Design a protein around this ligand. Structure first.
Ligand SMILES: NC(=O)c1ccc[n+]([C@@H]2O[C@H](COP(=O)([O-])OP(=O)(O)OC[C@H]3O[C@@H](n4cnc5c(N)ncnc54)[C@H](OP(=O)(O)O)[C@@H]3O)[C@@H](O)[C@H]2O)c1
Ligand SMILES: NC(=O)c1ccc[n+]([C@@H]2O[C@H](COP(=O)([O-])OP(=O)(O)OC[C@H]3O[C@@H](n4cnc5c(N)ncnc54)[C@H](OP(=O)(O)O)[C@@H]3O)[C@@H](O)[C@H]2O)c1
Lengths: 277, 277
């Protein structure tokens, strides 16, 4: 009766196995540059985990830490230098950027073929137009996770709660490519629980700890919890654990989506490399 | 009781009045180039209407007709010539292109600042990322039409049926910017009538004459009919006229969306001009 726990580590390992296999069939090794401004503790931990996993795979991985007060003109110069550096395959800027820096301007400076996070408007535009490109890592990880665990998304009623550029909107675009029926909900949706109750697959990316209660969830739903809420030294999802009483399967926090986000960044780094070479 | 008829001509006229006003406050006049390959009768009629209206506004408007068997290399050369022609503000390629021509390749050749149809992946990517750009004309026309007639889209349940790059997907993106809750449905949605029955605003762009029946429609819904189905020398929408019995307001065919599509192309032509100059 109780919900299965959709572990991200098991699904991420299948991605990592695919990556290791493809590397042997390659002359070179992919090279990832991660840029961080300042010392935000959540930012420090995230990049340390991206770097650690890239290196564990055998990538050339390098974190470039700058002071918080780096001028945006210096950031753009560095990115241009890395765009031209033919030995760098992937360029990643850790968000959030400090307020004196125009984030859109920085992201649009990254060359689209090195844009492993998929935020460049050319990659966004390729995603929604049906073409090839580098797409955002959490949405890729959510789609891959669902397909790993045997969900046939064709014809499924999917509700996505949250409409950010990092998760909800590229997620909605990727789910349409799997022929799902997609509802994008957000903070101005009225009677949100009634909207979510329709979902056979419910994906929540809002950043409110345990916001989603069991009355919001359809019996037998597949629930994917993207939230990562630091609360009392713990990590809390956006979905209340009581949802395991109603859902057929539920993503744990931590260890659900999070591992898949890292895995697909490693996969986007390979892809960016092969798209150039 | 019966549905109001949301005329596109009345809403289009408010756009045209805005355009005429802004032109007097301008030194120059916008210049539109429309390219057509072959002699498809629906294509001929569409471009003739875009040209006629651009000229009626006072634009420099020119249709370049080429043979159907024009090589795609010549098309791309012509577009590059027009991209560099500093006297051309808007470049438009009439679809469908003949099969020997890669449509994505042609559309991506148009400079984004002259891409009055909004298909270039940079304009698609700006739309979904929340930035500024030139967006597709029918979706713009649907949003503007609804706002013209007093629909407050914030918090509304909107269902969009059809997920093309020309209508459904840019429409979904534009509706999110108005804070609607958006459902994208399509040919693989199961129990489509039940999905559409939820919509307070229902937009249909599928190209099946009178497909949508009154049982599919929520009482008091606002129904926007994008279909244009040539049948028995008439023009039939995708929505059955019986829907006027249940809907609060319904877009006629012809004269509903169609006029708004033309108006927003004229508006995108102005915008492209001012974005350069
Ligand atoms: N595990 C991972 O790899 C990973 C990656 C990225 C983010 N995250 C987590 O996901 C969370 C969201 O961050 P984000 O950047 O994706 O999104 P975001 O832009 O920060 O906001 C999330 C969206 O959720 C909606 N929302 C917020 N509160 C709501 C409420 N009470 N009811 C209904 N809707 C509500 C908002 O809609 P409106 O726009 O309409 O206001 C907002 O756009 C964060 O806590 C972050 O830690 C995890
Ligand atoms: N008035 C205007 O300015 C204007 C402009 C453009 C188009 N149109 C009209 O709009 C119509 C659609 O053309 P388009 O290019 O926008 O779209 P399209 O790419 O040709 O197809 C429309 C979409 O509707 C869906 N669909 C088709 N039949 C369906 C059915 N029986 N049940 C549920 N969904 C169905 C399909 O979903 P799937 O992808 O899942 O198969 C398809 O993607 C055309 O007839 C065209 O004349 C009018």
């Amino acid at each position: 009766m109780a919900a299965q726990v959709l572990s991200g580590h098991e699904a991420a390992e299948a991605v990592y196995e695919e990556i290791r296999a493809r590397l042997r069939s390659l002359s070179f090794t992919p090279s990832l540059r991660v840029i961080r401004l300042g010392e935000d503790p959540a930012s420090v931990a995230y990049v340390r985990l991206k770097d650690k996993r890239a290196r564990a795979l055998g990538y050339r991985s390098q974190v470039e830490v700058y002071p918080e007060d780096l001028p945006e003109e210096a950031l753009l110069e560095r990115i241009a230098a890395l765009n031209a550096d033919e030995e760098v395959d992937g360029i990643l800027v850790q968000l959030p950027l400090p307020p004196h820096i125009r984030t859109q301007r920085v992201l649009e400076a990254i060359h689209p073929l090195k844009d492993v996070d998929g935020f460049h408007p050319l990659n966004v535009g390729r995603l929604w137009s049906g073409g090839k490109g580098l797409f955002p890592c959490t949405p890729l990880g959510v789609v891959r996770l669902l397909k790993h665990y045997g969900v046939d998304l064709r014809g499924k009623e999917v509700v996505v709660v949250g409409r950010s550029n990092i998760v909800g909107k590229p997620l909605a675009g990727l789910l349409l490519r799997e022929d799902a029926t997609v509802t994008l909900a957000h903070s101005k949706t009225q009677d949100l629980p009634e909207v979510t109750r329709r979902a056979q697959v419910l994906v929540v990316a809002v950043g409110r700890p345990h916001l989603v209660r069991k009355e919001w969830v359809r019996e037998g739903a597949i629930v994917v919890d993207v939230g990562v809420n630091r609360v009392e030294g713990r990590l809390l999802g956006d979905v209340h654990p009581e949802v395991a009483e109603v859902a057929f399967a539920l993503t744990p926090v931590p260890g659900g989506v999070g591992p898949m986000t890292v895995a697909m960044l490693m996969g986007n780094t390979l892809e960016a490399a092969l798209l150039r070479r």
